[PDB]
Design a binder for this molecule. Structure first.
Ligand SMILES: CC(=O)N[C@H]1CN2CC[C@H](O)[C@@H]2[C@@H](O)[C@@H]1O
Ligand SMILES: CC(=O)N[C@H]1CN2CC[C@H](O)[C@@H]2[C@@H](O)[C@@H]1O
Ligand SMILES: [Ca+2]
Ligand SMILES: [Ca+2]
Lengths: 633, 639
């Protein structure tokens, strides 16, 4: 198994022992990063001037002369060969040699190798991640982890642009990083270079940029300082701003100036990229001159970024054609998934899917905007790496599974379970949704429909729902305690607690469906308690100003549990002339459901659970009795 | 249902409405505290020269003098009568009137009273609580709540004596409380008074006391400061100290000096109590003269405390006679339960039992030394209140249940479930144990021995399953209970751990029940639950003596752990596998134990789970001076 999958692969039935004794050829001449990976793998093995031949080099090296016709004629291409006789690792270029080895490392299992021959190369030129979300920027240790991950997955591009980094956006875009941050970024560049990733430093000046000499030189002066820190690629982002910085001509002029006086003037600059203000079709004015002014005026080597037909979308053939025709070059894709900065109570841990797999030629680049949860975001990132490199062979589900087994081999099945029920976004103003819990959706829907209606439900559907809740709890508790990937566990823990709760609630509700009056009342009271605990988690974990709290299994599982609860409570009330409360979300205040957001109490007379100092949509007057009410808390 | 149960109760089969209109007689002259209760109960109702008569007062008061023949001739005794024509509430004295109303309040239900006649009084003169434990003394708000609870259950004695209050013990017993604390104590005393509790301020000066005039004077000066704060009863404790302070002759002289120059000089001093240095028979040096010296020299009015035949023990007739003959007066019992300050990883939430119910005449007082967990301690305190008032009718189990229902009416069943399996102490240096989980014990032992010997009863399996499910319901209901927040805050750590124990139980039973991969899923889940329990045990309740959180330790945990190991042995034999059968999660390798920052072999090589700055090793010792160690009987690291 290989990720990304090679363009061409021919395998035998045969396997070969990794050489105890071996002759290395091309060591001094090949990309040193690739030699480092190779030497890592042959540690504990003996080098010699006569032994199994291992040949490593770039096309043009003496070491790989015999194979020059075998090496694909593509940037980052390579040829790889394992047979009884020798091993070959030959890139079209230095990066190609590195990538050959990243594939070699995946072939190698328990000191054994398959007999194989591979011709490989990326279908999309630029592939990777833009850290370009709103919210807490990735930690330095997290960024270090990402860059190594990108290397292993042949992603060649990391665009640094955390919207909340004050040295990236307004107004301190004009200011050089302080010493500590500068040395961190310096180390990120070195580590990026070691793993063959272009560290692209972006800047986001358009909210308060003046179109005068002063700001122009401050911007170039900032680029110069970034250049002194080792940065060799650059971007200027004009997304999510208003005012004069939206001017397409000025933007074009500025990028051209950067290109002509900086990028075309330094010895060794690589990418120069901009993000447009009109960055998706729905935000683009068909009758305005923005995108055509940009396509016409931007120098042809400058990349232009695009998110698709909509603020969040998957890339279609009609979609990419539409933008390419306007900007006069293939779009450099900014894919807004799994970024969750607008649904911050959800984790998006589902598969990567929905992007046309036949349009490689039509895009210059493909980058994923991820979640503020760095490790969690690796599921999608690994998948994107696989998609951008070989889109024709992109396998949605198998790649998702491969990602998860890579990220957490010690508890892959458990993480699969968690992830599969943590993938939709819930309703949102962008209308973008993912499937979730699709395996159990038919059983759920049949179970529920029977019930409400008053027809008998299938025992098998009941057991499946039961099996699921059981598995959720084993998964939650094993993940909670996993020490192979702590940063991942730390990131997910609040959702994991909530996920266990949801499952326990489900179990108890299934018990309510199943024997006498008092058993039912024990179960019902247990459910109420479990709802309260969920509320507690939702009110104290992940309390950010936009979408605070912790939602999980929201698409299929929680609504099923909730609706089943209302239904059996209703029937118990008809049967025993009772008035048990059928409400499914715990709510300590009383009133058409109320919600509690941070220190606000809102209606989707109100009586709070206590006296608090009171505004209403100004009040510190004590208040217990009273569409949002804010209190002190 | 009345707690404490009255000495005499005659109930009719009639019920009376608490009158709309009532004319009150004796309210300007009766104990004001009692009046207050009584009018709080009559809010809603109207007063006037007409309607049903209610008579309140002490014997001798115009209001209730005609009932003298009904009023028991006992300190704190009372007579209460309810019938169609009138209500009588009549104390032998002011405290009796108060107590009469505490009984009245329990009779009153849904605005209705039964026709009854009660004649009541306590069988033991002093009854209450000594706050006398090691650890975090009770908070101020907790102490307020306690005094109100004593009022309600007829405990007349609160002895303040937290071992860790530096103004109570050494070094600063010589020093007056700072302003903040003094104001709080003064509040406490006021509240004590309003609830007919005697606030007894104790002092524990023995560890560093000099037998000269300067310390004698400072001790009296301190008592004088407490008197200015409103304290009217006092104690001197000479427990758990060494050196010159243990001299029985000098102790008696000092107590006699306090009596003669202070207690007999102030107008209104009530109790004067000492706790001895030999405070139990086992600790009492046979043929030594310590207790006889006290009994002979201490002024006859001074009380002497005693914790029974052993440091922790239940009081018996043989036992109380052996103390009384020596101290030449009836011992004042300091009962060491539910105090847990020497098993701080356990909560002791079981019934109060073991004390002879026939020996009321042989004791001057009976006080419980509780847990540092104030609200939790109310189960036992409520029960001791019931025992000390009416021993002859003391009912262990029904009183336990009654306490729980008074403490947490909204989730009494769930609290009982929690308490039932949180009552033993575990092995300890004092050898004192309590029963726990006795209901499921039979099914447990049968289940186990069918395995060890070589089938099991489908019914026992189900009993166990039922139990784990109840434990889970109760844990989750208790966590979210908002009727008694402070109680919940105290027990939460044990509640989490009790839930984990129950979950582990379900998963082990599923292991007892189908195919290879299902077994392994259950086994992996169990391993994770063991780790979670370790985590709670390493992060909650971290004190220096017995850190952690142990729960359901007598029957349930051992059952689960043995059932795990046994079926893992069977799986290993069956599938020729090598699953680890150990039941307590341990991150470090070689039975290892982790206490705070220590790693010790339960009395060749230890591999820690990481490199830590090592500090030292006791086996013989060495400073390690922060040297890094992963690889190496106790090791101390920087954790
Ligand atoms: C071009 C672009 O998508 N810009 C911002 C806005 N999008 C829309 C969806 C996210 O909020 C994402 C956010 O992370 C990005 O910084
Ligand atoms: C009289 C007495 O029991 N004194 C101390 C010693 N006992 C023995 C058992 C308790 O630790 C208890 C402790 O709380 C007391 O302060
Ligand atoms: Ca070369
Ligand atoms: Ca009077």
């Amino acid at each position: 198994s290989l990720q990304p999958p090679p363009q061409q692969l021919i395998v035998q039935n045969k396997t070969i022992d990794l050489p105890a004794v071996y002759q290395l050829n091309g060591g001094e001449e090949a990309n040193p990063h690739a030699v480092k990976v190779l030497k890592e793998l042959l540690s504990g093995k003996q080098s010699s001037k006569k032994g199994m031949l291992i040949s490593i080099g770039e096309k043009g090296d003496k070491s790989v002369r015999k194979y020059s016709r075998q090496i694909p004629d593509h940037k980052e291409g390579y040829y790889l060969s394992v047979n009884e006789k020798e091993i070959v690792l030959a890139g079209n270029d230095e990066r190609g040699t590195y990538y050959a080895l990243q594939t070699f490392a995946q072939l190698l299992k328990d000191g054994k190798l398959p007999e194989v021959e591979i011709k490989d190369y990326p279908s999309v030129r630029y592939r990777g991640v833009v850290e370009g979300f709103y919210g807490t920027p990735w930690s330095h240790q997290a960024r270090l982890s990402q860059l190594k991950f990108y290397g292993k997955n042949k992603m060649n591009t990391y665009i640094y642009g955390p919207k909340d980094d004050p040295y990236h956006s307004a107004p301190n875009w004009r200011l050089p990083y302080p010493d500590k941050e500068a040395a961190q970024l310096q180390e990120l560049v070195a580590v990026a270079n070691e793993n063959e990733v272009d560290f692209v430093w972006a800047i986001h000046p358009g909210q308060d940029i003046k179109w005068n000499k002063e700001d122009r030189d401050l911007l170039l002066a900032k680029f110069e300082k970034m250049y002194q820190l080792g940065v060799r690629s650059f971007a200027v982002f004009f997304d999510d701003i208003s005012g004069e910085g939206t001017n397409p001509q000025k933007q074009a002029e500025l990028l051209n100036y950067i290109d002509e006086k900086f990028a075309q003037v330094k010895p060794d600059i690589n990418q120069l990229v901009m993000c447009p203000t009109e960055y998706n079709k729905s935000w683009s004015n068909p009758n305005g001159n923005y995108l055509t002014t940009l396509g016409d005026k931007l120098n042809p080597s400058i990349q232009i970024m695009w998110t698709g037909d909509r603020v969040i979308s998957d890339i279609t053939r009609d979609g990419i054609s539409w933008i390419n025709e306007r900007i006069k070059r293939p779009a450099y894709i900014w894919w807004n998934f799994p970024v969750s900065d607008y649904v911050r109570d959800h984790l998006l841990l589902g598969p990567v899917y929905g992007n046309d797999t036949t349009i490689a030629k039509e895009m210059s680049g493909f980058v994923t905007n991820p979640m503020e949860h760095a490790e969690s975001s690796k599921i999608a990132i690994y998948s994107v790496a696989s998609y951008a490199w070989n889109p024709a062979k992109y396998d949605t589900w198998q790649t998702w599974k491969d990602a998860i087994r890579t990220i957490l081999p010690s508890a892959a099945e458990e993480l699969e379970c968690f992830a599969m029920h943590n993938s939709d976004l819930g309703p949102n103003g962008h209308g973008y949704r993912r499937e979730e819990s699709m395996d159990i959706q038919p059983a759920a829907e049949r179970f529920l429909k029977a019930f409400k209606e008053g027809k008998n439900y299938d025992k098998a559907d009941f057991e499946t729902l039961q099996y699921t809740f059981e598995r959720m709890k084993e998964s939650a508790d094993i993940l909670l305690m996993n020490t192979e990937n702590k940063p991942l566990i730390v990131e997910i823990t609040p959702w994991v607690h909530q996920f266990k709760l949801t499952a326990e609630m489900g179990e108890e509700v299934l018990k309510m469906v199943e024997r006498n009056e008092s058993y039912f009342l024990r179960k019902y009271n247990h459910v109420k308690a479990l709802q309260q605990q969920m509320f507690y988690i939702d009110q104290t974990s992940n309390q950010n100003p936009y979408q605070p709290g912790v939602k999980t299994a929201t698409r299929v599982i929680k609504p099923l549990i909730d609706r089943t609860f209302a239904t059996v409570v209703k029937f118990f009330n008809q049967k025993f002339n009772a008035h048990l409360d059928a409400t499914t979300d715990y709510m300590p205040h009383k009133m058409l459901p109320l919600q509690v957001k941070a220190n606000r109490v809102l209606i989707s007379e109100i009586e709070l659970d206590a006296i608090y100092p009171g505004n209403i949509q100004g009040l510190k007057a004590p208040v217990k009795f009273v569409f949002v009410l804010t209190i002190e808390k």
